[PDB]
Amino acid sequence: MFKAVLFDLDGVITDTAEYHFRAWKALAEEIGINGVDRQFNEQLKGVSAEDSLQKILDLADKKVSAEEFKELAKRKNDNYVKMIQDVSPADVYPGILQLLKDLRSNKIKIALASASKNGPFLLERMNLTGYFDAIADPAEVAASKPAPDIFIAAAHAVGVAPSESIGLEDSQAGIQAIKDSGALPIGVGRPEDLGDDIVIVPDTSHYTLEFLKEVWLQKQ
Template sequence: MFKGALFDLDGVIADTSVYHFQAWKKLIQDNFQQDLPSQLEEQTKGVSRADSLQRILDYLQIEVDTAKFQQLMQQKNEYYLQLLQTLTPDNILPGIKELLRELQQQKVKLALASASLNAPVILEKLQLSDYFAAIADPVAVKQGKPAPDIFLAAAGGINVTPQDCVAFEDSIAGIQAINQAQAFSVGIGSSVELAAADLLFAQTKELNLAQIETSYQQWKEGL
């Protein structure tokens, strides 16, 4: 059995990524009177606030100075926090709470590896804080996803080597980060987008601990 489980937050534990993109759309509309196309949502999944904003501005071919950039990030976070006020345990994605309970029963240590600065607040609103022994601080890592830093920090937070960890992600950048960290990657979503994952489930409700453990053991033997 693996010793650690590392979780992304948005799109894995709860679908808060929807709130992120709603906040980005409002921000760009309020400041630049432009609409964001839906295809940009995938590019902002799993990455930091600064990286998301830069990708959006690059797409729209908008340049701002450092002060304006910081102001836009702060304004977006205010919009996002307003949307989070409606968050409750009902927003936990199907199958996740059951998986967390199973992992806890198996004495697997859990850590959060999210780019979200609001992760502690979100876990509290979802009433899931007690499941996690560590929350990696995205401010403290040098590089965001797809670099492995946040997953390495999460594994370090529970004192488990990455090779002894299984990590859950729904974004391309997140799967790349897990693989670079040399942990076992479990993707949630489209097989086309997340083909690099070691194991893939279409939806959170399909997550199966026995299947994950079997695939992990086969992967570990191949190292």
């Protein structure tokens, strides 16, 4: 039986996309550009701050200095850190808390494998810190998803091999990263999005210890 579960944060444990979105929108408004709505934001999700800022400026054909670019990027980070101060246990996705408790009680290791620079803060605010055996630090990992590096680190950090682990993700790049680590992916979302070769559940309320065990037993 699997010895650990490696969690992404965004789309699995909670929604942090909402808060990047508002921070980009508050920046764009602040400098009198818009078009920064939830559709356009599809172009900003999981892309570099640099890339996000370019695309926003192109909305108004706006030109900036290097110092101005740097200040806008910082402003957005500031905005984001202000906006997540509201995060609470209320923001934990369905089934996630019960899953963590059942994993812990069965002595299965729990690790976070997230690019979030605020993972430890967010998990504290959601009252989930105690369940986690480790949080992979993205500042200490060489390559971002879909590279496997983050999931390897999260497994290693709790004393297991990725081939002893299940990884939970909602993104194409995240699923691929789990696969290349050697871990077994269980997706949350749409096969249209994440592939036909893996077990996908429609939402997080399907992520149960029972379900995870049945999938493990039925794997490759």
